[PDB]
Structure 1
Amino acid sequence: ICRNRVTNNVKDVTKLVANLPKDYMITLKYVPGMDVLPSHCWISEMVVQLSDSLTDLLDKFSNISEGLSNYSIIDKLVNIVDDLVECVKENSSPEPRLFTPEEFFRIFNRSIDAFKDFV
């Protein structure tokens, strides 16, 4: 359940993480110990927070029509995590912390890997 919500534009996250500067900082109210706790415990809060952070990231870029801009990739990821908010709320704060792209997208892919396993 909610697995079919997550389209496979997530497979573009690695191309996005390649184009974001190592130095850049992305901001995410991070549910403490989600790296440890079972999926059903954090996942509801995390998917709201990710939807927010990704829309902030979406403000930062602009829409290069030729090729895959970061704007296009992040846009389609916002479409995903918003639909995950929609199903989690239908079917079922922390303190802001600062992540480099590789770290923030680690958390993103872990959250999305929770839905292949959800209740």
Structure 2
Amino acid sequence: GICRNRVTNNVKDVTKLVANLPKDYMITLKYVPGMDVLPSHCWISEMVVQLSDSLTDLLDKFSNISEGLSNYSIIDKLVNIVDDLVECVKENSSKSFKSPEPRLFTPEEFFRIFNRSIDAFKDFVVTSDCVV
């Protein structure tokens, strides 16, 4: 329930941005293993920082459009968010940093994750189940 306020609702424009991305354009993420399974605190931090890298670069691949909604803008604001999270988290939750291997994802799977990550909040607190 902490930091839930840091996630502006520009999150809503992800679906459009996805529609405006070539179904075959493979995006790179350092996918933190088994997150899609559980729990929701064994990764959140890492994935949040990563999504920022990911988002940030993907953002350079576009230029700004005056009239209308550029994927540039959309991404830009997504980036503003994942950063503020990276912060509120490393400022509230306040580990041996070994980074996940890079993986490719279509813009859907990718943003599918992105979305799941923004949900890891709204119910975020301040590592045994991280099993398998």
Task: State the secondary structure of the residue aligned to 2:4.
Answer: coil
- Deviation (angstroms), 1:109: 0.4
Bigger radius of gyration, 1 or 2? 2
Question: What is the alpha-carbon distance in structure 1 between the residues aligned to residue 56 and residue 8 of structure 2?
Answer: 18
Moved over 2 A (4+): none
Give the SS at the match of 2:15. Answer: helix
How much identity, in percent, do the aligned residues show? 100
- Structure 2 portions without partners, runs of 5+: 95-99, 125-131
Q: CA RMSD in A?
A: 2.7
The alignment's TM-score, normalised by the length of structure 1, stands at 0.97
> How far did 1:117 drift?
1.4
Partner-residue secondary structure (3-state), 1:35: coil
Structure 1 distance, partners of 2:46, 2:77, is 20
Distance between the aligned counterparts of 1:73 and 1:26, measured in 2?
Answer: 16
What CA distance in whole angstroms lies between the structure 1 residues aligned with 2:40 and 2:66? 37
SS at match of 1:38: coil
Residue 37 of structure 1, CA deviation: 1.4
The 2-side partners of 1:26 and 1:2 are apart by 27
- CA deviation profile, 1:19-66 (whole Å, cap 9, x unmatched): 000000100000000001111111010000000000011110000111
The reply to whether residue 117 of structure 1 matches residue 132 of structure 2 is no
The SS at the match of 2:37 is coil
Give TM-score scaled by structure 2 length: 0.88
Q: Report the CA distance between 1:116 and its aligned residue.
A: 1.1
In the alignment, does 2:71 pair up with 1:46? Answer: no
In 1, the alpha carbon distance for the partners of 2:39 and 2:3 equals 17
Higher helix share: 1
Alpha-carbon distance in structure 2 between the residues aligned to 1:65 and 1:89: 35
Aligned to 2:127: none
